[PDB]
Structures are given as C-alpha cells and as structure tokens.
Amino acid sequence: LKSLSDLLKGKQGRFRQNLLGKRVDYSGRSVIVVGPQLKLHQCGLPKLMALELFKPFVMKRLVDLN
Amino acid sequence: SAYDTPLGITNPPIDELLSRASSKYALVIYAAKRARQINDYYNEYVGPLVEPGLQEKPLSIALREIHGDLLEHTEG
C-alpha cells in the first residue's frame, strides 16, 4: 500500500516528480522547419497554432475593435 | 557603429538601453513596471509620454521611453 511518506519519497515523489516538471497553459508544441526569409529575432508560427495560442489576446483586440 | 535600422522587437537596440539602466536585470523591471503603468493608464496613471503608435503595445512604448531618457529609477 502507498503510505503518506510514499507520496514524498521516490522518483515518483511529490518533491521530485510533481514539483520540478509540470504541464503549462498558453503553450504549444510542433515540428520545426527552416525559415531563411526570417530575421534572427523573428520565428515563423503555424497560423492554426498561433490563432489558438493567442486566442484570448486576439479575442481582447477583437472586442477592442467592433 | 552603424546597424542601418532596427525592426520589430530588436527596436530599440539593447546596448543603447544598457547605458540607461544599471543592468539588463534592472532594465527588465524598469520597462515592465512602466509597461504595467501604461497598461493601467488605459483602465498609478501617468503616460504614455512619447507619441505612441496607432496599434502599439505598452512594452514597445516603455522600451522606446527608457531609450529617450523620459524616466528615472531607484534601486532598492
């Protein structure tokens, strides 16, 4: 049986597993391709990702505009 | 020391900002708190100081302003 102390101890411990690496919101993942047209500071974002990734920010400006 | 012109986020150039604030780490908060103020003004309500763009962001305005020397900071 998983004890109270068994929550804390181990590689699957609270201290280790469920505090050092978490899932995050306002975040995407995709496959990278080259973008040699882009300036160093620029990066190319897939529009179908971008749309969802900035959904509230674009919603804000979409309510700001009529 | 010519770069022709900056574009997007790399405007204004960082080396000309590092002169203004003590360090990049200061400059961050320098710009950020000012930006939070500029954000608040639309809704501490002082700014925007420099003539802003039509659809411009507070960070851009703040980072533009520090370069112009319209602001002063106190290190805690």
Side-chain angles (χ1 to χ4, degrees), chain B residues 2-43 45-76:
Chain B
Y3 44 75
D4 192 42
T5 182
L7 55 149
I9 296 184
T10 214
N11 174 70
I14 50 147
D15 288 275
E16 297 199 56
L17 302 176
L18 294 186
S19 60
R20 310 302 200 264
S22 55
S23 294
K24 55 180 68 177
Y25 295 116
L27 175 57
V28 157
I29 306 300
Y30 209 141
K33 294 284 283 292
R34 180 73 194 104
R36 287 174 67 76
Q37 211 170 20
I38 295 153
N39 274 294
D40 200 57
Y41 178 74
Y42 298 116
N43 309 132
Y45 54 106
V46 192
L49 298 174
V50 301
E51 177 54 37
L54 302 183
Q55 303 145 25
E56 196 166 39
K57 290 207 157 282
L59 258 300
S60 304
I61 293 158
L63 204 67
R64 263 177 62 191
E65 280 161 352
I66 178 54
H67 190 273
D69 284 290
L70 286 82
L71 309 174
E72 195 167 310
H73 74 127
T74 67
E75 293 179 289

Side-chain angles (χ1 to χ4, degrees), chain A residues 41-42 57 60-61, chain B residues 7-10 55 57:
Chain A
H41 75 283
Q42 301 177 338
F57 287 92
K60 178 259 283 180
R61 192 73 217 181
Chain B
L7 55 149
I9 296 184
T10 214
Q55 303 145 25
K57 290 207 157 282

